[PDB]
Design a protein around this ligand. Structure first.
Ligand SMILES: Cn1c(=O)c(=O)n(C)c2ccccc21
Length: 113
């Protein structure tokens, strides 16, 4: 199939590119549950870019689809929790659009391995 180290290098670069689309850094760290006490009533699996980085280095992403699944959780959790008329909801829509393009290019590079 493919070698581990170039794949992880690609995922590290891809995660950096996704974070660059989140210009407010609102997805950089976990949603603060102390300030959002009802969050887990709605959200089954919180996700954020710091957690994704930890998972990457813990060798928890060994195919592109598991990496993309967690990125999609960042977006979908935000759309689910927040009302449509909020900056947060719109930011997740924009991240879905801009990040989908980053992911398509990165997946093509993975398929070259
Ligand atoms: C409730 N909440 C969210 O749903 C969210 O997506 N982000 C990014 C949040 C960021 C800070 C505080 C609360 C948040």
């Amino acid at each position: 199939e493919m070698q581990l180290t170039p794949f992880l290098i690609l995922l590290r670069k891809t995660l950096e590119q996704l974070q660059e689309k989140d210009t407010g850094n609102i997805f950089s760290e976990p949603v603060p549950l102390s300030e959002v006490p009802d969050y887990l009533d709605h959200i089954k699996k919180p996700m954020d870019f710091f957690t994704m980085k930890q998972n990457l280095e813990a060798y928890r992403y060994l195919n592109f689809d598991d990496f993309e699944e967690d990125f999609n959780l960042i977006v979908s959790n935000c759309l689910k929790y927040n009302a449509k008329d909020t900056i947060f909801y719109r930011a997740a829509v924009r991240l879905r659009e801009q990040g989908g393009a980053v992911l398509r290019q990165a997946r093509r590079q993975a398929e070259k391995m």
